């Protein structure tokens, strides 16, 4: 009986590289961050970061390091470049930079090439990458390389592609990211404005309800799996309707629309509260302003 209205949420755009600068008490000078999202469904997948280490006349080697999804330590760009497919330094520098007359970019990239020289092929590169990708003990080289390949394929930039045999696009995107970071670090281009409305998105009822329905459908799928794990050993044909509980999704939707807590009921913490609000019916102008509120 209560009139609830979903308030639009202002978030940052996906599949875009945003470059920012760090403070003085930090060994990092520039950080390029990008929250990648799939085109179908419009859900968040992961966030990739690339940090340039080295303060002004402090830090010796001015190397750049990337942070892969599900990793425990930073990996330089040369290692992931040699693990992607291009192992010669000439092809790497050709894909990254496009101006041979500028020597400042070459001098800034020289420490990275000097640090990432012990890796001369792709096998040892994948083996070293998989060791930091939250790997257990006992996977061995025969499976660690396959695990690192699966880590590099999916998760890492899924908006580009996900099928096999398409690493050239990923290498070109990484080279463009490194080139943009080096151009922003050379004081040739100002940092990206976080308050720019062009890089912002307004999620209304559509994507929010889609994510809620996806979470509820995943929960219902897990429940149906657990039910079939017990209603099969008896060797009896189920009536289908008895395996699908229509109360979970409805209760979750009602709770999320009445209390406003976006997420599960048992996980109220670390959740966005205030998505659904009580519709103000004091006057016409109040309702018109509440219907168009972000």
């Amino acid at each position: 009986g209560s009139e609830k209205v979903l308030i639009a949420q202002e978030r940052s755009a996906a599949n875009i590289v945003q470059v920012f600068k760090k403070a003085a008490p930090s060994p990092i000078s520039h950080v390029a961050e990008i929250r990648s999202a799939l085109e179908k469904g419009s859900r968040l997948i992961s966030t990739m970061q690339i940090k340039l280490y080295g303060r002004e006349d402090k830090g010796t080697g001015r190397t750049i390091k990337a942070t892969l999804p599900y990793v425990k330590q930073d990996i330089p760009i040369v290692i992931v470049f040699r693990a992607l497919g291009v192992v010669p330094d000439g092809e790497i520098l050709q894909h990254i930079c496009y101006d041979e007359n500028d020597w400042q970019m070459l001098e800034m990239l020289k420490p990275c090439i000097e640090e990432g020289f012990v890796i001369q092929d792709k096998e040892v590169a994948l083996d070293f990458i998989g060791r930091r990708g939250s790997a257990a003990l006992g996977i061995r080289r025969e499976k660690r390389i396959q695990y690192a390949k699966d880590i590099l394929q999916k998760e890492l930039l899924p908006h580009i592609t996900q099928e096999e045999g398409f690493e050239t696009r990923k290498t070109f995107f990484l080279g463009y990211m490194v080139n943009r970071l080096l151009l922003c670090a050379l004081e040739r281009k100002d940092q990206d404005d976080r308050d720019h409305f062009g890089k912002k998105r307004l999620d209304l009822a559509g994507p929010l309800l889609a994510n809620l329905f996806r979470i509820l459908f995943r929960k219902l799928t897990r429940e149906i799996y657990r039910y079939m794990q017990r209603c099969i050993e008896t060797d009896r044909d189920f009536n289908l309707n008895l395996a699908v509980k229509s109360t979970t999704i409805t209760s979750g939707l009602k709770y999320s629309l009445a209390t406003g807590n976006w997420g599960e009921q048992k996980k109220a913490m670390s959740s966005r509260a205030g998505v659904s609000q009580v519709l103000n019916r004091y006057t016409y102008s109040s309702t018109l302003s509440h219907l168009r509120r972000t």
């Binding site: 001098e107 090439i113 020289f117 004081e187």
Partner: protein, 111 residues
């Protein structure tokens, strides 16, 4: 301009041959060694000026957001050109404008 090797495709490094006493460019993954043509190895510019008038594009005239001026071109002498401030994002960048014609694409100031 730092060249690379044409065999294993890798960067070269400067070395001093003492038997002949000369500067050479030698690789680290193979045994390729070539003669050096420039004695300069490293150069660091403290008061540098690169990045001021280095980025020149050809489609700069199709931007309607750029204002126009009535400056005479030293080549074709056309009364249709654009002008813009220095693209160098430094805190001590001079406010001197640079003009670009829509024919020969030449950069000049008003000094």
């Amino acid at each position: 301009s730092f060249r690379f090797c044409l065999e294993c495709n890798n960067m070269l490094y400067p070395k001093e041959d003492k038997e002949n006493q000369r500067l050479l460019y030698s690789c680290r993954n193979c045994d390729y060694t070539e003669l050096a043509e420039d004695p300069k190895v490293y150069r660091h510019e403290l008061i540098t000026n690169i990045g001021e008038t280095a980025g020149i594009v050809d489609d700069i005239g199709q931007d309607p957001t750029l204002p126009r001026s009535d400056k005479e071109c030293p080549e074709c002498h056309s009364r249709d050109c654009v002008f813009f401030q220095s693209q160098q994002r430094r805190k001590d960048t001079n406010m001197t404008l640079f003009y670009v014609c829509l024919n020969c694409k030449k950069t000049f100031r008003d000094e």
